[PDB]
Design a protein around this ligand. Sequence first.
Ligand SMILES: C[C@H]1O[C@H](O[C@H]2[C@H](O)[C@@H](O)[C@@H](O)O[C@@H]2CO)[C@H](O)[C@@H](O)[C@@H]1N[C@H]1C=C(CO)[C@@H](O[C@H]2O[C@H](CO)[C@@H](O[C@H]3O[C@H](CO)[C@@H](O)[C@H](O)[C@H]3O)[C@H](O)[C@H]2O)[C@H](O)[C@H]1O
Ligand SMILES: *[C@@H]1O[C@H](CO)[C@@H](O)[C@H](O)[C@H]1NC(C)=O
Ligand SMILES: [Ca+2]
Ligand SMILES: [Cl-]
Length: 496
Amino acid sequence: QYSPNTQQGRTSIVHLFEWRWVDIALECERYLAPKGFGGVQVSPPNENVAIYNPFRPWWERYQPVSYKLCTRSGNEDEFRNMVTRCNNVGVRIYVDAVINHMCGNAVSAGTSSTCGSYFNPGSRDFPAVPYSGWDFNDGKCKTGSGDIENYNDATQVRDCRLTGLLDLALEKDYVRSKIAEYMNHLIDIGVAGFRLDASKHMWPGDIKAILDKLHNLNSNWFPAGSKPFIYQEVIDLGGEPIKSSDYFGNGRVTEFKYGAKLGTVIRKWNGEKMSYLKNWGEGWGFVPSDRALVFVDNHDNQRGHGAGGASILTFWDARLYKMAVGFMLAHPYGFTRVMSSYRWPRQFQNGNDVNDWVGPPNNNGVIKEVTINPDTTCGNDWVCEHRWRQIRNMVIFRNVVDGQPFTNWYDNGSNQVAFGRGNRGFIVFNNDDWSFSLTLQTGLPAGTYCDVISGDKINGNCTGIKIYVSDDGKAHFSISNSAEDPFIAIHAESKL
Ligand SMILES: C[C@H]1O[C@H](O[C@H]2[C@H](O)[C@@H](O)[C@@H](O)O[C@@H]2CO)[C@H](O)[C@@H](O)[C@@H]1N[C@H]1C=C(CO)[C@@H](O[C@H]2O[C@H](CO)[C@@H](O[C@H]3O[C@H](CO)[C@@H](O)[C@H](O)[C@H]3O)[C@H](O)[C@H]2O)[C@H](O)[C@H]1O
Ligand SMILES: *[C@@H]1O[C@H](CO)[C@@H](O)[C@H](O)[C@H]1NC(C)=O
Ligand SMILES: [Ca+2]
Ligand SMILES: [Cl-]
């Protein structure tokens, strides 16, 4: 469960948040595959409640009605077409599996779902699965509200309702089997792994029982004996009885301390400095690298949901965000996930965004197609951070230096740092309020290298900054604090 099952040489996955299947399918062929991306995390592919108040929020997708592959992203035929086309070009698909619960207990009964399936939350009736009252934790939860009231009680966190979401009785073989039937359908279609949504709200033993029922990956694309890649969403910032370590036996875990701390350092809050990043990783109290799924921001915290707070860096903070993402994919710690978002009318009032619910770009509820501009950026309000030169090039940087040790660290005691990855890559950062101009040891072979942040290597030439490395591995770096991107990165493949 710990291996990504990505094609050899590809080291990152991208979250194409709310993208339609047909859009992901062609993105796999026209961009992801040739640019060296390892895989894609897709939004929940199962039928969900259609919420009209507020109008079709992104979060309606986290309220299951059935396990039919029928959503605003497309139907089953379109899903399978996507998985097939992506796998054919070496790009894997990872499903966001919402298995801890069904929809909100307060949702009106009827057929207000993405595929017309009937459901009755009040009576716990979900005939499309089918689930009944005997399949929920109503009689198991011990809180007065029936919802999770205190995270200091590990039992209610698992047996009660997360914000009113009907909690599935995961100890029952029937329920474990229905979830496995769903996941096995996806595995046989060709999916490579899953993001286990709300894993903190499930007992590690129940998750394990479910995973024991899973099929080995489809033998038409994967080697025999391949296991689905499993990463569990467990928000562990340290002050609770539940630890992410409790889930290591099932697969990898999301390390939310990563983006939270990276944001604080980059923003220079509480007197933190980039120079402190010398021992970044386990030294900061993070989970072991081989059990970590890292990222700067996710679909939740980029908009005030989940955990991380105001420190979280997002596309809205473009300049600093690129540096954060840059540092992340240059550093050897964990398996990296890049975020790809859509723009929404963010409206702050008293410090909170009142439009944090806004769903993906749409026309009367129908998700807009992802259009590509001549400069390779996206239209229709899709941000496409994965297409930004600075991010895309760093995704490649990670592929190029994979396996190389962390070496040749430099710091000025403040916010100007640098380090290399073996003899295959080097990166320099300037986050201070003054210019950086110094000759550093890179560990790279002598020659002329193209800075992949300010430009690209094209037709035997660089379109941006050029770095000259001497026989002894030294090279001069000059970064003004006024630069568009205050960081430079060079690697074995950007060499002239
Ligand atoms: C959001 C975060 O809360 C905890 O995270 C806790 C954390 O564990 C704790 O330590 C501390 O930091 O507070 C955090 C926030 O409560 C969990 O532990 C963590 O697993 C979870 N994150 C995952 C799962 C949920 C549920 O499927 C999804 O919710 C997402 O979908 C839900 C269903 O539509 C949304 O509720 C929505 O529907 C409910 C129906 O009853 C309404 O009551 C609610 O007001 C409405 O917002 C929710 O706002 C949204 O974020 C989310 O997108 C996904 O990423
Ligand atoms: C490389 O760039 C220079 C200009 O900087 C140009 O003279 C040369 O023709 C370019 N080389 C190729 C192969 O295009
Ligand atoms: Ca639960
Ligand atoms: Cl996540």
